[model samples]
Every structure is written in C-alpha cells, then in structure tokens.
Target: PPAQLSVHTVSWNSGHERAPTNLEELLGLNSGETPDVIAVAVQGFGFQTDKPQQGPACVKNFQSLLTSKGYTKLKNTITETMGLTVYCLEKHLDQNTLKNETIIVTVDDQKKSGGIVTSFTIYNKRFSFTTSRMSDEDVTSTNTKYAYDTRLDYSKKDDPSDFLFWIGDLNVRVETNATHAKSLVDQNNIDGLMAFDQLKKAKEQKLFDGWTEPQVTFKPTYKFKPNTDEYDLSATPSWTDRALYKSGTGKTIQPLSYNSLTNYKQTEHRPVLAKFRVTL
Candidate 1:
C-alpha cells in the first residue's frame, strides 16, 4: 500500500472571461510531465435557478482533451458560479467504488451563495474537492465572512478523504494602492507586497485555518488589463485566484512549484497553478 502520488491543480475565476480552445498549457501538456491526478477549479454561473449551464467552452475543451487523452472524469459538480472537476488515469480508478456528492447552499432569497463539492475513490485512496463563490454581502457579517463559515458541510462526512483540495476565487484582495502595488511588482519586491495580502487577514480571522499557500515569488495575479499583460490599476492588484494545501489523514504532501500561469492573459486575472507530490 505504499506508492507515490502526483497531483496538479489549477484555479481560475474566469468570471465572464473567454475560453481557451485547447488544453496544451492549461493541463501542463506543454510542460511534458504528466501527473497521476488532475484537479481543476473554476467559478462561473450555473444551477437550476441558473441556466442548464455546464461552464464556459473552456470547460468543455478540458473535458474533451482529457477524454481523448485516456483520463476518466472522476467527478464534476457545478453550483451557480462555482465548478469543481477531477480526473485520473482510468486504470487507477475503481469505478464502482466512487462516491460523488454535490451540495447547494443558498441564503434567504439569494441564490448566489453556495458551492460544489465532488469526492471519489482513486487508487484505493479517497479524495474530495470543492470550489465556491460567496455573495458580496456576506463579507460584512463577521460570522459569514469566510468560506469556512458559509460553505456546505463538506467536512461532516463519516470518514474524510486521504487527500483533499479546496480551491476557488477566494475573493482576497491585495488591499494596497495601485502605485505602491505597481512599484513593488516593478522592483520584484514580493516580500514587501506580502503585507497587503488579505488572505493573511482572513487567516487571522480564522478563515482557511491550517491551509498552506506556497511562498509566492510571482507578481500579483489580478486586476490586469483584459487580453494584455498590463495591470489596469483601476482596482488593487491581488492574488485572488489561489491554490492552498493541507495534509489529510496523516499523509505527507509537498508542493513542488506554485505560481500564476502568465501565458494566458485573455482575462483580467491570470490563472494560478500548483503541483504537489503526495506520499501514499
């Protein structure tokens, strides 16, 4: 029962943004190394109150890409603006043993307040994934300020997974002026800019407690000019699209690399990708 596990995860807000026609760089096929598992988190709009919306074309692009590449779709669930999908080599899956659950959490009179969680068994190990979007209104109340509070009861299962990934557009802003943020990026002063990361404040507020974000040496990944490499400066730049990790059930995990995918600049926010090696 001892083996090595490799996982690659990418998260993008992609909110109202266009979709890529292919998955070359999207799935890291351009890098030439294939991970044992692939997890993707995207936040857009969908649901029953919603259109029968699946996701943007880019979601379909990924699905077709993985399908042709011999990877089986492990789980996919979309709730309103949030979507979570996981895929694995078909050989590694016990198709009959899989368990995929999707939940919708809506507030009073507002359908825009929820998430989607998908879980399944792979290589005899359990894995659960979630991605969500919170209403702009919830950020005010201290009780409903963070995802940990408003998200569905994903953690209440009888036995949690051996590996878990909870990701999305966490809505964390840099909270700095445009000039200062731009200067820091120009000087490559990542350390100086770290002080303004709102995720740290959220952590202090007991949000995403125990989750670890890799040390970021890259520039802020948000508030960019659409279809360009330029920061718009209209809003504070931030690491809004994030990838966070935590060791589940006593297994050891390490992220080999973490950074924003700078090549795809089609939207105002660049996608962030993370690679991890988990011991099983």
Candidate 2:
C-alpha cells in the first residue's frame, strides 16, 4: 500500500431539493484524480427508511456513480433530518479494519441533529471521519458538548486516531450587518467579511480548539439565491458548510484544496468540498 492516501469530503444543506446530476463534480472526480475515500454529508435531506421510494432512488443515484468508479459504500446512516455516507476505494477494503457509529442530538425528543463517525485502521494508522450539525445557538459549543463527545475521542492518550476530519453544515454565520456584508461580497472582499465570521470568534473563544480549517478563497456558501449567484440579503452570506481536520497521533493531514461547488445551485446553500492527503 502507498504511504499516503487522499480523502475527499463534501457537505451540503440541500434544502430538501433533489440530488443534482453532476456527481462527478460533487465528488471531485471531475479533476480526474480519484481519491482513496469520500465522505458525503447532507442536512435538510434524508432517505426515510419507512417510506422507501424517494430515498431508494436518491441512494441509487449515488451508488451507481460510485460503483462505476470502483468505490464501495462503507457506511450510510440517515436519520429524520440528516444523512451521512462514506465510500472507500475497493482496493483499500481488504487491507483495512473499519467500524462506524452514530450519535443523535435531539430537541424536545425529536431527532433533529447529530453525527455519523466512521473510522478505519490502515497501515497501522487510525483515521476518522465525522459529519454532523448543531442548531445556531453557539454552534461550536453545541457541537463539542453534544456532537463531538460521542465521536471516537482522538484526544485520548491511548489508541488515538492519527487523523480526524469533521465536515458538515456548521451553522456558523457572519456577525455583520446584511447590507455591509453584501457590499463586501459585491466587492469580492472576503477577508473583510470573514473578520466578522462567527467561526473565527468561536475559535478565539477556545472552541474547535485544535482543529484547522483550510484558508477559504471562495465566496460565502450560504444565503445565496437558489440557482443563482445573487445573495439573498435577508441574511449575511457566510461559510456555513465547512471541513476541519486534526491529527492526534502526530501524523500529517494536509488539505490539498478547499472550496465551494457552485455548480450545485439547487439549494439556498452551496455545497463545500475539501480534499486532503494523510501520511501514514
């Protein structure tokens, strides 16, 4: 096996819209570089197991695409309001040990939010992928207190994961006035608007303490007019969908590319994609 592996992750708040047809771009395959693994997370979309028609068709769409690319669905978990699916290159399956689990965060006893964590041991190294979300109330706080604690704690001294990835709709927003934020967006001044990003504030507040997000060069992935480049000024455009990485065993996890997939214009929020290479 190679000493390094490439992993790609995508997250979208689909707004209950139908899955798009360009799976190649959505999965980063349009670049013609096949990753070793892919993880997909969706909020505002779910395959209701009890009512199988739509869910089955949606899953079939993904399965068909991945299958043709020699990927095997490692795990797929869906709840009332969220979905997480993981796929691995077929060649890696026989050489690795894999396990997965899910955690649900509720509101008034309703399964409204949570995460799916999948881990694998390859080349004697442990790697984890977690996709989750929390409501807008102090997202970093709720994520740590509820969503992340249930993950396989890479922070543990024993059997710590060599690499950990968290990707999903984080619900973080720009703490700026809509008019000013839109003006900055219009001027392509992402740096100015990002100064007021809630995630930055949360990091300063010591949340997502050790995690690292790749520099964002793309425009805000949220508050867009569906199917258009225009910003809906009712709310400040923000990078709500995100991907963060951490290495607990001192291994290297480097982001190769991080940006939003604007081709997906079916939802109010655009999808975000991140690619990484992890050293063994």
Number of the predicted model whose TM-score against the real structure is largest: 2
Which candidate comes out best when scored by lDDT?
Answer: 2
Worst 10 residues of 2 by lDDT: 141-150
Candidate 2 clash pair list:
none
Per-residue lDDT of candidate 1, residues 1-280 (tens digit) = 4488788888888875545775667766677777878888877654323444434565578777787777887777665566677888776766577665556555535556556666776667777666766655674334554555435333444665677677778767787898998999899999889889888888888777667788898899888988788999998778877877765577777888888888888888888888888888
Quote the positional error of residue 81 for candidate 2 in Å: 1.6
Query: Model 2, 229-252: lDDT tens per residue?
Result: 888888878888899899987888
Off by over 4 Å in 2: 49-52, 100-108, 137-153, 156-158
What C-alpha lDDT, on a 0 to 100 scale, does residue 207 get in candidate 1? 74
Q: On a 0 to 100 scale, what is the lDDT of residue 278 in model 2?
A: 90
